[PDB]
Design a binder for these strands. Structure first.
Ligand SMILES: [K+]
Ligand SMILES: [K+]
Ligand SMILES: [Mg+2]
Ligand SMILES: [Mg+2]
Ligand SMILES: [Mg+2]
Ligand SMILES: [Mg+2]
Ligand SMILES: [Mg+2]
Ligand SMILES: [Mg+2]
Ligand SMILES: [Mg+2]
Ligand SMILES: [Mg+2]
Ligand SMILES: [Zn+2]
Ligand SMILES: [Zn+2]
Lengths: 80, 46, 49, 178, 135, 120
RNA sequence: AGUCUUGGAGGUAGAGCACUGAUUGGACUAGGGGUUACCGAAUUCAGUCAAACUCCGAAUGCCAAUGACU
RNA sequence: GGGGCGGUCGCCUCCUAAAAGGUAACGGAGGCGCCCAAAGGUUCCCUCAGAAUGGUUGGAAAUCAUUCGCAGAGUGUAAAGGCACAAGGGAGCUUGACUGCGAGACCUACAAGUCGAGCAGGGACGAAAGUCGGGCUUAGUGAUCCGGUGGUUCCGCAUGGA
RNA sequence: UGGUGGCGAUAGCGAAGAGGUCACACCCGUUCCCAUACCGAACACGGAAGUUAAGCUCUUCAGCGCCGAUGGUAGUCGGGGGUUUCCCCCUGUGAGAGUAGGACGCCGCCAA
RNA sequence: GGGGCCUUAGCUCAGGGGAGAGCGCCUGCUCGCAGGAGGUCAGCGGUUCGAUCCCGCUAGGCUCCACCA
C-alpha cells in the first residue's frame, strides 16, 4: 500500500520575455517585451500596457538600453 | 486658526489670593487662583 | 453575498450596463451617471428593480 | 507675550555670552511645545476621547487632533486606526502663553510638587514632562471631570545638548527639582 | 547528533558533487586537521562517530572544531514499495564534502596526539583523507 | 534639536513629480518658473536640446518696482516672458509650476502669460 | 542556411554572502537563572552552506542587423 | 511503474527547467472558483519597518518628541516579478468599473486567451499639459443546444395583424 | 553666483575648514488671497530689522560607499581519454572573489 | 500499511477576541445549601494584533479497508 502526493499542480507557462530583437524594425503596436512588473521600462516611443507589456508606439528600430545604474529600458527610434 | 473649532483666546487677568495680578493668555477673561508662584510654600522656601 | 446588477437609463429605460455590488454594503439601488448609447449622453442610470 | 519679550531681551543675550555662540542664529530657542494625552481607556468608551479632546482644548486654547492606533495589539485590545489619544502642537504666541501659564500657575498646583526632573531631557535638548492630573490647569472645572487623566508635555528646542536646553528652560523659569 | 534546528524545505534534490571545496580548504581555527581527498555525503552519524573517536583519544586534552555541518536532508521511501506516489519521507542529514574540504580541526595537543586522533576519526568516514597543518 | 530639510529640497522633490509628465519640445517648450524670497523668474526651456529659448525676470530693467516678490511683480514678468517669446516664434507652451502650488505669484505669472500671447 | 562581424534579451555553470533561510568558533554582553561569565539573546570579528538565496556572473544556446565569403 | 483500493482531474504562482521561449513524472511547494461603490478615476500632497534617548497612567509592546533609518515596511489575497521621479500613505472632486471601435502585435492545432497606439461620441478630474475603456502585474472561470428577460427602421407561409 | 538640463555614487555618505554686498537662503509679519484631520510647522501671501549658524557655493581628505584592470583560478563551447555519483588532456573562451589603480564632478543652456 | 474520526479541569461535557457549565473534591453547614480548587485546551511550528478555535505536521486511541493471483 502507498500514500499520495499533495502537489502535482502548475499553471500554464505565459511565454514572457523579449518578442523583438535589438536592431530589429518593428511596426507601431508591436509587442517588444512581456513581463510581470517593470523588469524593463518603456523608453522613447514605447508604451507600457495594463499587464506591463512593452509595445512600440511608432514604426522604427528597437533598442534595449541601460536606464541609469540598475534598470533597463527599451526604445523605438524612427528610421531615417 | 480654522474658523469655528478654536476657543476665542483673550488676554486674561489672573488674580491670586496674595494680591499678585498677572496677564496670561486664556479663554476666560478672569482667572482666580488660590496659589501662585509667589505664594506657593514650595517657591517661598518656607 | 456579492450579486450581479443591471443599470438602466432613467430617461429611456434601456438596460445599458451590468455590474456587481455587495448587497450588505450597498442595500439600496445604486445610481451612476453613465453614457447612454440611445440618448448619446451621460444620463443617470439606476439598478433595476 | 511676557516670556517672548524676556527671551529676546534677556535670555538670548545671556545664552550667547554663556555658550560663546558665533552668531545669534545658533542661540537655543523653544521651537514648539507638544502636549499629549494617551487615552488607552478609549478602547472601552468612545466618548472618553471626546471628553479628553474638550479638556485639552480648554488647556491648550486649540483644538487637538485625535490620535489613532497605528498597529493592532491584542494585549491592549487595540485595532489599527482606533482613536486612543489626543495630541496638540503649540507654536509662536500660544506656545509662550501655555508655557508661562504652565510654569506660573499649573505646576505649583501639583499636589506635593517637588519641582520638575532635571533628567527628563532626551540627549538632544528636548524636555519631556509627565503631568499626573489635568486638574492642575485652572481651565478644568472639577465637577465636569468624569475621570482624572494625565498628559505628557514635550518642550522641543533648537538646542543640540541637554546643558543648553536646561539653561534655556532655567532662564525661562522652569522649576527644576533642587 | 548534529541537525538543523529548522529547514526551509524538508525534501531537497540530491544535487551533484562536482569540483573541489568552495571554502574551508585550509586549517583556519585549530593547529592540525583532516582534509577530504574524495567527494562524499558525510552523515551526521559518521560525524558523531568521528568526533567521539578523536575526542576520546585526546583525554579532554584539546579542542575540536567540526568544520562541516549536516544541513542537507535526504529522503527514503518505506521498505518494499513500488516507484512513484510522491517523494519519500525525510530519513537523515548529510554534509556535502568535496575534495580539499577540511572536515575537523584540532588544537591544544601535540602533532603526535593530533595525528593519531585524526587517524582514528578517518576510519569512521567513507572517504580517503590526509592529515594537514595550518600554514 | 529640530533638524528640517530646506524648502527648496522639498520643492525639488515636488518639481521632479511635475517633470515626470511635463517636458518641453521645440514646438511646445516648457515655461519654467522659479520664485524666490525676494524675486520671481521665468525661463522658456527646450528639454530635448537642453536650451533656454527665452527668459524674463524681476532682475530685468524693464520691470522697475521696489516691491519685487509679490503678485503685482509676477504679472509684469509673465507679460515680458510672453512678449519676448513671441519674437522668437513661440505660441504653444507647457506651464511647469516648478513644484510651487498653482496659486498667487506663480498663477499670476501664468495668467499674465496667457493674457499676453502664449497658449496653454 | 552556415560562418565571420556587430548589437541585444536572459540569471544557468561557477562564485558570493548584499537579502532570505541554515550554520561553526572567538570576542563582548542585554537579560534570565544560581552578587556571579552561572548560562546567555543581540552586537562584533573571523568561518561554512543553499533546486524553490543572490551584491555578482560565464561558456554556450537564442533573437536580430549589416556587409562579406560560401 | 499491472488492476482494485487510496489520490488526482479546470485555473493561478514558484522550483525542477540545463542564463530566449517551451519542456515530463502519482516530482518539490502554495493558492483560486473572489473581494472593493473605493480597495476604481483624477488632482494635489506625502513617506515606511524597527531601534536609540526622554516620557503620569503605561508595562517589552498603545500615544507623543527627538535623532538614526533603502526599505529591514506596505502593496485586499498565493507566489513570483515589480514598485520610494512610488505601483506604498493621505485628502478634495468624481463614476472612464464609458458607447462605437481599432493600425499593429503576442500567444496559439482549433476553440479561445492577451496587449494595443489611435479615431469618433459624450464625460470625470486638472489652471493647463494631460491622465482615465477598473484594481502594481499575472487566478476569481465554463463551449454549444435549449429556455427566460429587456430592446429592436429585421422576417411574418394569400393579405392586414398575430 | 542663481536658475534649469544631461551624464551609471568616478557624482554619494562622512570629516575639516572657508565664503556672502548683490544673488540664494535662513529670517521677521499674518491684514488679505490661501492653509493646517491641531498648529502661518508646512503651504500661502507681505516685508527687508541681520545672520552666514544651517541649506547653498568653493576648497582639503580615501575612513566608509562607489568605479576598477592585468595576471591567475573556477566554470565552459568544441575535440579526445579514463580507474566514470566523478576525473584528466588539447585548441578556444573565461568569471566571481582578491588586487594594482581610479575617484571628494563631468558636460551644457539662460540670467545676473 | 492506506483512508476517516477523535484527544478541553480528577471525571463528563460549552466554545478568531482571550476556557465555562455540572459533577467530583474542598470550605461550614443545618443533606441540601452557600461559596472555592481543578486547564502545557493531546504534542509541535505558523497563519495571524488575536488561535481551544483556522493551517500543516507528530503521537496515542477508535472505526473502516489491506483485494486478484
Ligand atoms: K512495476
Ligand atoms: K481619490
Ligand atoms: Mg509558471
Ligand atoms: Mg487590468
Ligand atoms: Mg552552484
Ligand atoms: Mg477510488
Ligand atoms: Mg536554455
Ligand atoms: Mg527559460
Ligand atoms: Mg445537445
Ligand atoms: Mg400573413
Ligand atoms: Zn499667590
Ligand atoms: Zn437613455
Amino acid at each position: 500500500g502507498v500514500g499520495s502526493t499533495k502537489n502535482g499542480r502548475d499553471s500554464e507557462a505565459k511565454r514572457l520575455g523579449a518578442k523583438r530583437a535589438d536592431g530589429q524594425f518593428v511596426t507601431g503596436g508591436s509587442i517588444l517585451y512581456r513581463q510581470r512588473g517593470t523588469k524593463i521600462y518603456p523608453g522613447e516611443n514605447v508604451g507600457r500596457g495594463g499587464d506591463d507589456t512593452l509595445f512600440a508606439k511608432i514604426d522604427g528600430t528597437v533598442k534595449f538600453e541601460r536606464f541609469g545604474r540598475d534598470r533597463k529600458k527599451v526604445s523605438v527610434y524612427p528610421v531615417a | 486658526m480654522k474658523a469655528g473649532i478654536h476657543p476665542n483666546f483673550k488676554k486674561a487677568t489672573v488674580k491670586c489670593a496674595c494680591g499678585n495680578e498677572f496677564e496670561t493668555g486664556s479663554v476666560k477673561e478672569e482667572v482666580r487662583v488660590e496659589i501662585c508662584s509667589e505664594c506657593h510654600p514650595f517657591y517661598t522656601g518656607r | 453575498m456579492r450579486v450581479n446588477i443591471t443599470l438602466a437609463c432613467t430617461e429611456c429605460g434601456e438596460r445599458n450596463y451590468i455590474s456587481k455590488k455587495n448587497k450588505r454594503n450597498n442595500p439600496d439601488r445604486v445610481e451612476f451617471k453613465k453614457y447612454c448609447p440611445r440618448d448619446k449622453k451621460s444620463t443617470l442610470h439606476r439598478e433595476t428593480k | 507675550n511676557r516670556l517672548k519679550e524676556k527671551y529676546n531681551k534677556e535670555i538670548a543675550p545671556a545664552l550667547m555670552t554663556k555658550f560663546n555662540y558665533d552668531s545669534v542664529m545658533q542661540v537655543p530657542k523653544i521651537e514648539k511645545i507638544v502636549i499629549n494625552m494617551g487615552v488607552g481607556d478609549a478602547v472601552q468608551n468612545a466618548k472618553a476621547i471626546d471628553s479628553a479632546v474638550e479638556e485639552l482644548t480648554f488647556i491648550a486654547g486649540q483644538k487637538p487632533v485625535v490620535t489613532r492606533a497605528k498597529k493592532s495589539i491584542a494585549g491592549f485590545r487595540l485595532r489599527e486606526g482606533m482613536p486612543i489619544g489626543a495630541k496638540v502642537t503649540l507654536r509662536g504666541e500660544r506656545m509662550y502663553d501655555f508655557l508661562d501659564k504652565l510654569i506660573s500657575v499649573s505646576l505649583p498646583r501639583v499636589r506635593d510638587f517637588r519641582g520638575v526632573s532635571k533628567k527628563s531631557f532626551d540627549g538632544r535638548g528636548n524636555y519631556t514632562l509627565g503631568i499626573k492630573e489635568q486638574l492642575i490647569f485652572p481651565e478644568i472645572d472639577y465637577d465636569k471631570v468624569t475621570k482624572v487623566r494625565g498628559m505628557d508635555i514635550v518642550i522641543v528646542t533648537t538646542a543640540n545638548t541637554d546643558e543648553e536646553a536646561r539653561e534655556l528652560l532655567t532662564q525661562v523659569g522652569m522649576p527644576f527639582q533642587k | 547528533m548534529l541537525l538543523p534546528k529548522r529547514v526551509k524545505y524538508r525534501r531537497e534534490h540530491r544535487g551533484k558533487m562536482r569540483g573541489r571545496a568552495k571554502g574551508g580548504t585550509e586549517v583556519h581555527f585549530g593547529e592540525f586537521g583532516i582534509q577530504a581527498l574524495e567527494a562524499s555525503w558525510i552523515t551526521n552519524r559518521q560525524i558523531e562517530a568521528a568526533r567521539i573517536a578523536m575526542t576520546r583519544y585526546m583525554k579532554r586534552g584539546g579542542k575540536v572544531w567540526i568544520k562541516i555541518f549536516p544541513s542537507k536532508p535526504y529522503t527514503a521511501k518505506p521498505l518494499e514499495v513500488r516507484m512513484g506516489s510522491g517523494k519519500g519521507a525525510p530519513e537523515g542529514w548529510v554534509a556535502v564534502v568535496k575534495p580539499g574540504k577540511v572536515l575537523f580541526e584540532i588544537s591544544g595537543v601535540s602533532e603526535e596526539v593530533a595525528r593519531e586522533a585524526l587517524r582514528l576519526a578517518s576510519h569512521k568516514l567513507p572517504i580517503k583523507t590526509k592529515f594537514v597543518k595550518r600554514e | 534639536m529640530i533638524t528640517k530639510t530646506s524648502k527648496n529640497a522639498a520643492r525639488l522633490k515636488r518639481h521632479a513629480r511635475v517633470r515626470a509628465k511635463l517636458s518641453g519640445t521645440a514646438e511646445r517648450p516648457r515655461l519654467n518658473v522659479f520664485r524666490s524670497n525676494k524675486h520671481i523668474y521665468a525661463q522658456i526651456i527646450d528639454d530635448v536640446n537642453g536650451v533656454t529659448l527665452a527668459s524674463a525676470s524681476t532682475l530685468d530693467k524693464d520691470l522697475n518696482v521696489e516691491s519685487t516678490g509679490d503678485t503685482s511683480a509676477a504679472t509684469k514678468v509673465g507679460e515680458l516672458v510672453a512678449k519676448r517669446a513671441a519674437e522668437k516664434g513661440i505660441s504653444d507652451v507647457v506651464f511647469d509650476r516648478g513644484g510651487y502650488l498653482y496659486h498667487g505669484r506663480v498663477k499670476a505669472l501664468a495668467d499674465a502669460a496667457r493674457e499676453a500671447g502664449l497658449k496653454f
